[model samples]
Target chain A: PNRISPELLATCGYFMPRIFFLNSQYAPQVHWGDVVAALSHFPAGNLDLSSEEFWYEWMINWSKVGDSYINIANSAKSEVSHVRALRSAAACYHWAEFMYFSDRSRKIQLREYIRSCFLSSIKYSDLLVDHQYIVVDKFHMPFFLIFPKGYKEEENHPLPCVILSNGLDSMTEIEILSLAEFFLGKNMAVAIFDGPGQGINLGKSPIAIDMELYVSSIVKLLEDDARINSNLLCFLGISFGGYFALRVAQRIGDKFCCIVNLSGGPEIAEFDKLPRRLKEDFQFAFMQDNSHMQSIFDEIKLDISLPCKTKVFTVHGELDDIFQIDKVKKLDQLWGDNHQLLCYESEAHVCLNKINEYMIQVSDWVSEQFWLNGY
Target chain B: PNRISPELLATCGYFMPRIFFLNSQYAPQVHWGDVVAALSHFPAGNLDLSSEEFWYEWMINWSKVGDSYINIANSAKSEVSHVRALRSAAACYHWAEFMYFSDRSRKIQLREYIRSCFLSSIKYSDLLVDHQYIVVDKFHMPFFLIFPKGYKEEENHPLPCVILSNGLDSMTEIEILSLAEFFLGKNMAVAIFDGPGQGINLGKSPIAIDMELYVSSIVKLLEDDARINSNLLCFLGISFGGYFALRVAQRIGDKFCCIVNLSGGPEIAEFDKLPRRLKEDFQFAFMQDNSHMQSIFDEIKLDISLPCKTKVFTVHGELDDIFQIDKVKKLDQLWGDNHQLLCYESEAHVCLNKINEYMIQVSDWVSEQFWLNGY
Candidate 1:
């Protein structure tokens, strides 16, 4: 394997468009033009929000929270170890984004408060597991610990599990460890990872960060893991992981309980229409630089995004310039009932709206849907 | 005025099919069958939550969050006074639901936990005003007050105002109060009432509730009240209020800045579809026993709920038996960009899919788009 270089991590934004090659079968770049072009086609109405079509569509997207989370969670992993790592990473990525963009400090503080609540909710339960697997090499699949109060592992319990995934530029280990504390307290086990292009993957690893292949490995791990109740496994992905999530679900099928997309896209073909230069945008902060490409125009032509197949749910913002809700809507149009789209009317990209309130609402809702035995 | 009658209050939930009773020149009561019938024939799948539609509705409705509190330091009384009480009530309702619903909690501790969160949120924000009418011979309006942080009567801040109305059910004053608080914290004022035949109306006012006349009364209240920002006044109706909200908007035209239907209805022409016995069941609840109606009907019909309106952000849950997503979807058939709908896939009545999250999302998003900088 080639040794890592500073150039790989120094790039602040998108992948070069002309560099179509997938080095070692792992994708790390997204041509900027495709995203802008995709956004250009997004339709906008008059400032007046009173129209019927406007409101109907508004409700339709928000209705899809579960599907979006499931799509991202069920994403492919190289091993169950990686899935666990990604789960934590997903949470962290969200936290970081909130810190970076929210206009109000209260919003950032709330995100932290909610994260603590989620951790505390599951901190004392018996389902909590702190797993570390010596995979292909020594891959420390890091996670937090939590257990449902009064939960007894001796009794065969069919518990629901939520798997989290991080975008490229995040600390997957820290996120998973934090989440583990929350889920375990609630009597649920959580697995987090920093797969290829993230955490140790970018720092040190021989495996290629092939999205689909990585998620598939996680399915096999879940199937074999004694702690996992097979049926309870769910995948949750944030930002860039949305594409990888679809690949995993597409390949693994029902192995994943469900897949969630925090702010996924089907294709950013319309983004090219935007006047902004896509490659230079900080929204795609995770992309590694490729020196081979010389021009931004060249980057636009590269096909770096993933194809959608899994049962998916998407959470997006209306004012999100990072990527618009249109991409998710288009993905839903293709997936139909299998796809659910949840749009936060006030948000713009990821879990940063009314931060604390948003996190608390989703965590409680997810706990109800996945952990509750009876409605 | 008739003396208070326990019998009338007892029969609050009952609604005989096809039994149309006129309360006044503007208000009328039709059979529950009619309500359900209207819901049955309502159109479906019409709103545009995608980029094709508005931005805030698509982004803010789905992001989850934690608790919401009023910031008294920054609040403008004109904006927060009306809704202060209601938002606190809504928070309590949410905490109770989550405590009971999430697998993270045992059934034993849930009620207590819910009680605490409810009390806490309310104590910190709610404003219950039992005021005497200055000109009326002898009448009082018990309104909820909501305010953002740092609200000062001495300060002159142009802010938005909303008049809120619930149906003829016995929703706790606290819950109603909470709804107002939520809007208040967003710097909007909300006025909630048990208009004639609804809440204290039939029991306290003696006159049956009339839609058009009751709304006109509200408009009149706005005109008479110096505290209210007449130029920014809007109307929000939940369930039955949907029918009245639009009627008032239409009658007042531009006089009312905005109209929001939180699961409202369209017409009484729908009474022809109910089973004769079921229609009687409704009448039993309306006039005989109202408390059991929301649950009894919830257990049976998941579609005959909410109202229909144009120029509003109408919200409905997919699992709602009273008024399903299909009906909300029909908004596009009757209206256009002036309306926005939020549909919760896992949410039943009360916007329970991820109610708290949606609330916060809407609180922030709607505040900015529909109400911020004054309506």
Candidate 2:
């Protein structure tokens, strides 16, 4: 039975398991055997239904159109029989936003489209899936969380925690699933929070200079919980999260067990120097409702210089012009050795576009630090 | 009553779905309701996992670590029972690699480390994953495809297809799954090839030049595929793949149904005038081995004069200095109405760091093309 069919291994087993996305949450410690055993008994093929493993395989596929769970949202069957339906629906909404921005005539409409679509989707949800905003300091930081049924904090260790942030354009359930799955699997906790000037916080309240206070507050919440690996507390920031992480790094510094900034920015202090059109474009996004663009621009241009000591992992695209390959290297340089850089030649700012590959890489690196590499 | 009990969802009636870490051939596309039904015959509580509508949520919980099926590879169960006892083995390999890289003492031996690790990982034979060089040419060429087990040559009428490429790193199973799942779900065809000097092509017979040939080859492959939807052929480029897609748009001109370059390099040609260190970085990555530095540098200095008619979606970061935010705008300027820019304030290149947001954006945009805009 150990002959291990390639098909099985390809779909059920981990080819690159050590990676955080495929194997352990972060490295050094692992739960490998449990995964395989669970895989071994997968009953889909036997029951005449495709196994749970089958879906995982599909989700991991990066070459197909419907390959993304977003497809499930688009599927008539997905509408009725698929798991993660809410996420799928949200994916559909997010996809529309992506198109609106990517469309030449509609790129200018990205701000409105993203906000409207996001709000509209939330309208259909009950407490199970709804957006929340918590004002911290001068801004209203937005957040979303899906509590497991009867989430008992008193019985279980408080719960290891995670606060996920979104990139510039689309914010959907499928995106949240990636982060949620990782932490939940680890028996940790997760919170999909929108930081200063992000998501609902930006849409509903004034964007503020609260990177440190925001992250610190999240950490403080996790610290209050016993279930979380307070010692192993981690922050996984993506895209704009990159810059967010940088700001947090300056503020939080050594509070996180590890900080992973994915496809992040490097020109922290150079926001003012951006091309006129590009600056105008985002200013246009924030100013969609007649807000003062000048003040917002000035604030964004302000820098949060953090000296991060938490094992920092910065993954970036060498050919990434949006954030530039050099910026990634510079970030690593600034973070020093505790920081590691995983640069993909073919990747853009959004790593999940290369989902499996990015997950594998991130998972592996994170695992190494947490499980293998001694901090 | 949509109140399903945890006991019903967990025990005999409950379906404990597993998230397999494999390719699409073995992947399944069941909805949330299916999980609910699988978990319990009577689906009256909480949210209906059996209701196809709940697939997204069900899948999310199922993949979470503490969930019954959260069988991460290194877990004791997976490691012991995995087909070849290769459980969590991937993690070890990764640790060794990261250690090799992170240990400043080993930095001098980078090439040797890369070669050995590459060979070790490549030793396994499970599936055919496309690398960068094999996908598209510098002149923007496209490559061929290998169908799934059930794909029949008799199938005609040019079915719809997805062109999947990797981001700025080594190729992985994720790319493979993306292609397989999307095509398999829609009953369409799929194509995956590498770009210049990447993956097998890079590790083996490395040929990194004239990327136009690479993109052109992909288009040609679709043309030859009988099951592909001639009118709906789309290119989903990740990270640097976006750059290639952009070049392809310039070269293929009107041949693509929908072309998306997520977090890609934009009009980097102008940066050819940058300082030496920056110029060398691009040259080194493109060439990989760092020998043909001068000629590549010379090439970068040349002005990009190509103007094509393909609709483009470009995503980048304002803080990106490697590819430079200016370059993306410059690239955008070069295309005018035919192109759209998704600029993230603090986002980085290829958007790998915070992939969730990236994926949502990409999927939403793609769906928009298929649905709303009628791209």
Candidate 3:
């Protein structure tokens, strides 16, 4: 049975609306204009639209928008206008690329387009910087280590850094902008990359139950670099990425100064009870069928009772449908007094109803912890 | 005579709860803990409480919280914990400072205490750099020019700058944190200051109806500084400061690359129609009696058809009580196509309910404009 509410389907269609609630997970990325434009393309009374149909329709419509922007970028009057249109086109392409994994035939080609658009965005970026890639065990990790203007690595001085991870159905290039910008504001270097089985790396590497390997690998690479303040490291994960972060905390004890778990579930046994689309997306990401996926989920568990004093802040929607209140509360109880559990009473599934509130809280809490850790 | 809603008074025990609304405007400065703690202090069934009684109760309760943090700061085991406590105290004190102007006897002392707490916050700032004051026209305007870590003044290069103005009932020190960090994330320098008649300057430099002088003075000061990018300048105003930003746009068209007005009104003739406490606070800020305040409002008018091609973005709540939709719509009609108007259907003043959406929109728009203008 579909777990999505009837009201949600009728109002937002099969696809989630880019709104305060549905769009809260991707706060900075999806805009009102995109919502207005994308919603207009859907036929009236699309309650019967399947998730597959929803993705295809929105993707096709937004692809047209992306093409229009590309055309505008080509004919724009000034270099600035040219780049502006290019970035907008990139944004459009990225928007369309979301949750289109069901169409395996077109997925590779679509991923290529998303990469090209993002490259063009970086090319036109006025900061005169471009993204870089790091090869981790033959898997090329596409990453952006963005710094504020006039920033140059000082000799023997490492900068405080924040590493961001993407959740299911979100891309690093699209999901990392808001959080990256926020860390930049706090004067910290931000590293945003696609880990195994996520974003651009999807289909290249099967999603692993042991996700801490990716964090460990990335942390090692960053520590080797002289420009990064290795001691003042932080990790932030959103949605299911929160669960990955919690797992990292369990395995890698005091490696990070702070870890932020934003609505990540600590256990995966309940995964079967989630909405069909969510379950389907997980299988697609990991390239596994039901039995194999079940084994993977069964193997993954977040140790909430892990006796670590490393600062941890967990934010959750009290009424999260997928994770359930009982599951989240169980994790919170084991979090101990050293950590903070911020539960939004009126929120659901990552506190989308209060996205701004929680985002700010998470950022501020992380920023303060950085100072507290002598960063 | 009282325009404040019954539901608002009974539930929030005032015109509106600042923890949710005003704190929403500066999401980074206040956290859920602050909101929960502040809200808990209000007694249930406060429907009959006058605005004066409401402010007094909340203020007193929050003041105690501030004091508790200050005490924590004093006895904290570590310097970092001490500073964290100090900053929290600063926020709590400033939160209480709002609406306390009605109590004439303690106003001055409260203002002094607020300033000291903020200074303490700056003193304990991790970066070792604190907020500074600039002498503009004999009035010592408090300002903080925050730069990202590893920021240095490059030869023959001034960084992109955003000058912020605080609105009525919002203090500069508290309100500027979220916006400042956002620009920093965009790799831009941020300049936040209180013009005459706002924050600590209240009563001392009684708010002048012609607020453009403060903007003009601050602009000239910034232009003279080698570290500031003069050509790529932008202005942001909140609440009444929105009106002030409009005034600045009119008087000095080409001075800024762009301007953002978040829920500012163009006419003051409707001032009398606002909630009684809001009007009362205005009088207190301007240090004027009712008839004199009327004369001041009568003399104030915002030009809608100002002939400036500079990019403008205005965000408003459709249900905003103070600036009503009709009044905001009038201002938008005059904005021309060079500007964008974003209105939230379910928001109050400043789109606080949907702050993340508009804030992300405004920040992205501002960041794009900076790039478009070759900043």
Candidate 4:
């Protein structure tokens, strides 16, 4: 039967055949039948596991089709047509980066191409998007800063900025781009970056558990910009980024307005049962094998008794399987009344079911915090 | 046991427990168990048909839950939070209209509420969105015109305008608002209207086959505006509006730059096979019984041998069941080479699978036509 039971779709975090088919709506040339053929090419004995060949074929075909769009964009005379084609190419390249790559150089090269496509599209768009790169520990850490329309004329003063951080197993640039418009519509400047061992910087730098070092360096660079309101700066991290955002809040609480942890928990090093893809992703990020994953984990420490002066807000799913709700609740209990925690009933992982709801709530909360602090 | 079989899910045009369950991710408060229970309340004997009681119950609960967000928006001091809540309320009210209502008064009332929510949200958004109404033969026709940012100061010249027409079963205002950014991103102003039987105007004005009467009235209004580039006006229609767009093009080819028929076709009056909901929707739009449907159907004439000036682009899914691809091909063949028809392989109605592909391609083609006309 061609039918995939909901039970089977749910088991793989809805990332394999289901997402592959669903994403075809975005990448039109990637046919579902082609994906099915590739799936049959792989053995069903590893059906329950992540088949590298399956994903490799899935992304490889998409990137090749993306080449067609790029070629069209190259020949188009109109800037509008060029931008549309380039953005489509960027999305395709980003998906291609999802395949597990054993060769680190190829992964970095794909990320660079994705970035190039995005930047090319940005040139023709009306929005103000700027690319900036900084040297951190001899590694190139790249970030994007986008200013809201009428930023300079409407307000002669520096604008409030929200710095976005990436997480484990994430498409940093594409996701950030998707969410940036919401913030921009709210009349706020946005900065998105790939910290050490995340997104495009994965192979460029080794995974470091020192969240303060990575976040603080970016903050320092943003503070130097005349257009950014230093006192009104805010920080947000998703998934494992929740851990990093909270850790940064504890260290530099006074410098920022507030902090948000979306489905983030403490004690990330406390390894529990995980999907095979999750384990493999973590090892890849750390540039280590299964045996060396513990060494990277040992660097993560969530045990903190110190109270944070910055206002903190955390949103978590009640039915999270990865970082169970109990762990998040434990952190809230230790923090006492100093922080706010919201648990959505029956939601798993990052409460993706109510993503728009929380996205609005978090940004609004940040706006209120900025106002209260007189930023 | 908890899983919903794919076979059962596919029976209702994929719009039953499946959409309800999948939409739960967007509306987190709506529980899956509650929906499953409601589905069980209905008999399986009519599972393939439109279940009024089912969708009524489905959207009713969501609108009630939306009240909570509306209340929050009322009290929220931040403008961004207020806009978010209002948009959420607008979406809920829209789904509530999905339940086919026999009472014409109640249907009109629901549409009014939906319009109110959208207008309230538009007031708070950063973009300049204007609500305009015109009187056509004693009937009030309302539409929205969203000006691209920097249109007044930066352009200093007349801006190209894209007029969006509503389909038989569609919300003109809401869908236009959702996709307006695409046109705005291309430096083009956008206008969306409730013409004849579509959207809020249904029942208020009966479904009229002479689309030219409604479209020309709107065009006359835009022509009077000083900021609109009279020669660069573009027309686009979705679903059934595809037929209307083509009809308009055949009649008024000299008035605009180009036309796009997204998943649209000709020979609509042929009255082929239709789903129960489609039949119900047609009767509701015309505010007539089943017998009167044929009178309205007779008004639709797709046989057109004459073609003059405007460039035309039509995109259709090869697998579309509503308006079969063969009928569209017949129209394309008769139109000859003046129009370009693109048929997507293995796509369903509206090319939902390749929406992004066609959306970009359509807009890009429009830009080229506008530029070629020196708009």
DockQ of 1: 0.02
lDDT by residue for model 2 over B1-375, one digit each (tens)? Answer: 111244443322111211222212222122222232233234344354323334333333322311211133234232112211122222222222221212323322322333333334333323232333333323332243534434555754445666766543424233334334544444445676545544223322333434556656666655764555556766766655666676667766577766777666644534445432344334434544345555653554324457755667777766554467776787788778877888876544543322333444454555456554343
| Candidates ranked by TM-score | 4, 3, 2, 1
Off by over 4 Å in 2: A1-87, A99-133, A138-140, A146-155, A172-174, A201-209, A226-229, A268-281, A284-306, A351-353, A367-375, B1-375
Q: What residue runs in model 3 are displaced by over 4 Å at the alpha carbon?
A: A1-154, A157-170, A173-193, A202-205, A212-266, A275-281, A287-296, A299-375, B1-154, B157-165, B174-196, B203-205, B210-266, B275-277, B289-292, B301-375
Which stretches of model 4 miss by more than 4 angstroms?
A1-54, A61-72, A75-77, A99-103, A125-130, A177-183, A269-272, B1-49, B61-72, B102-106, B153-155, B177-180, B269-272, B306-309
- Scanning candidate 4 chain A in windows of ten residues, the lowest lDDT window is A20-29
- Model 3, B139-191: lDDT tens per residue? 78777777654566663367788888888777666666655655665567777
DockQ of each: 0.02, 0.01, 0.05, 0.21
Docking class for candidate 3: incorrect
Candidate 2 chain B lowest-lDDT run of ten = B12-21
lDDT of 1 by residue, A1-375 (tens): 011112221121112111111110011111111121212222344112223343233222222322232243354221221222232233323332321321224323433433343344333222443545425344454333233434556784645566677654334434334333334434565556556544444323322335555555565666676656766666776665665565565666466546777665544434344323333222223233323222322332223243344455667766656556765666667667777777776454553422222333334444544534341
Over the stretch A192-298, how does candidate 3's per-residue lDDT look in tens digits?
Answer: 77777777777667766676777787788779878787788888888878888787777784788898887888775455666646767777788887667666776
TM-score of model 2 (CA atoms): 0.38
For residues A262-366, could you state the per-residue lDDT of candidate 4 as single tens digits? 887776534435654666677777777777665566566566587666888999887766666787787788887768998987666776645655666777788
Deviation (Å) of A174 in candidate 4: 2.0
Rank by lDDT (best first): 4, 3, 2, 1
True lDDT of residue A34, candidate 4: 27
Top-scoring candidate (TM-score)? 4
Docking class of 4: incorrect
